[PDB]
A paper describes a structure:
It is believed that GtgE inactivates Rab32 proteolytically and thereby prevents the delivery of antimicrobial factors that would impair Salmonella infection. Furthermore, by using a combination of biochemical characterization, molecular dynamics simulation, and binding studies, we demonstrate that GtgE shows exclusive selectivity for the inactive GDP-bound state of Rab32.
The high affinity of GtgEC45A for Rab32:GDP allowed us to purify thecomplex. Crystals obtained after reductively alkylating the truncated Rab3218-201:GDP:GtgE21-214,C45A-complex and the full-length complex Rab321-225:GDP:GtgE1-228,C45A diffracted up to 2.3 Å and 2.9 Å resolution, respectively. The average B-factor of the full-length complex is higher than for the truncated complex, though the entire electron density is well defined for both structures.
Author numbering:
A (entry chain B): 21 to 145, 156 to 195
B (entry chain A): 23 to 217
Write the structure that this text describes.
């Protein structure tokens, strides 16, 4: 029996759906309204990965820093995985993927020198163009926070890659 | 070097598999309690408060703004050191002199005004967060942090706590004109004499 605490970052340009992905995955919820509240510093999902191992997953929303691109130490500190999110049907946010990925790999990495697993999320529901995964992405998914189409499977894929390390 | 004996509370449940949005309760209990006991906040939380033990969201800004007044929790007084720090937070510098003022600013407040609460934008969530400064150690250059997201109090580095103050005092990070962000202290705190 084992228990794991994994910290993953949800990064991407403004308006792609980073928060909606977290809101859907953790709270089974998708709403349009917003409540300014004082609660938590990040989000938590717990998964019964298998009969012996338990995985606690911290989803860190980049939040305000998304507008600037640079990450603070206290944010990327000790991250073991990452979700790079862009808005499909909008070419402006796919250009910024390379900017977010480069900044990620330079600030945080595995303790053995390798890059952290990163999953590219094409939100808001081309397929031949999976060569972009040559940039260091472990995989990509077509996700939708409104309909909950691939967010579940995209998360298990990241946990799987983290668990190999 | 200087540490206040205040009790630590986590906004996780005993098993650790549930994350409540109780940071506002824990932080308040730190600065209002004494001698490692718990403050009588049972009247506020237990009274079927929707913000207490909530998975989705915590207390509302406007509601918490009034709650701080009720419990005599004010923003720390203005001071020259405080101005130096705020001026440095706007530029995001942390050299030798800024760290010298940081050491003096933290150590002064803890001695004269007791533990401090920090209302700041959350690092990994679109809401706000609350954590407490309960002590300081000038030999290792660390500050004792009571963050209810953690399992216990943590001696965190000055650079890391400085980067977290930046979120609350730099317009680059605080948005929607949330005037509730800042450093608070217990109004009824009485410092001990120096000699
Ligand atoms: N149709 C659709 N809209 C979405 C989806 N995810 C997010 N949105 C919309 O995108 C807008 C901004 O998304 P948001 O969660 O704020 O992304 P963020 O700014 O990166 O955190 C919101 O108004 C949502 O309604 C989705 O899966 N489908
Ligand atoms: Mg967001």
């Amino acid at each position: 029996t084992r228990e794991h605490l994994f910290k993953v970052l949800v990064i991407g340009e403004l308006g792609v759906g980073k928060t909606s992905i977290i809101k859907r995955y953790v709270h089974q919820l998708f709403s349009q309204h917003y409540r300014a509240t004082i609660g938590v510093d990040f989000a938590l999902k717990v998964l019964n990965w298998d009969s012996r191992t338990l995985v606690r997953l911290q989803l860190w929303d980049i939040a305000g820093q998304e507008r600037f691109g640079n990450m603070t130490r206290v944010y990327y500190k000790e991250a073991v995985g990452a979700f790079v999110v862009f808005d499909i049907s909008r070419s402006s946010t796919f250009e910024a993927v390379l900017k977010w990925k480069s900044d990620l790999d330079s600030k945080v990495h595995l303790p053995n020198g390798s890059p952290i697993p990163a999953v590219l999320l094409a939100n808001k529901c081309s397929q031949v163009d999976q060569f972009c995964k040559e940039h260091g992405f472990a995989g990509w998914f077509e996700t939708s926070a409104k309909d909950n189409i691939n967010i579940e499977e995209a998360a298990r894929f990241l946990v799987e890659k983290i668990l190999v390390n | 070097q200087i540490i206040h004996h205040r009790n630590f509370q986590s906004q996780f449940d005993t098993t650790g598999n549930t994350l409540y949005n109780n940071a506002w309760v824990c932080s308040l209990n730190v600065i209002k309690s004494r001698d490692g006991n718990n403050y009588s906040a049972l009247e506020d939380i237990t009274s079927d408060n929707q913000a207490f033990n909530n998975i989705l969201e915590g207390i509302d800004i406007i509601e918490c703004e009034n709650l701080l007044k009720e419990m005599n929790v004010q923003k720390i007084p203005e001071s020259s050191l405080f101005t130096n720090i705020k001026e440095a937070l706007q530029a995001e510098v942390f050299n030798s002199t800024v760290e010298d003022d940081f050491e003096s600013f933290i150590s002064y407040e803890l001695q004269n005004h007791g533990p401090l609460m920090l209302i700041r934008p959350s690092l990994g969530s679109e809401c706000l967060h609350a954590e407490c400064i309960v002590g300081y150690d000038s030999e290792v250059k660390k500050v004792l942090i009571y963050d209810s997201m953690n399992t216990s109090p943590e001696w965190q580095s000055n650079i890391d706590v400085y980067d977290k103050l930046t979120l609350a005092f730099n317009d680059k990070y605080k948005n929607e004109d949330c005037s509730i962000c800042g450093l608070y202290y217990d109004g009824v705190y009485e410092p001990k004499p120096l000699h």
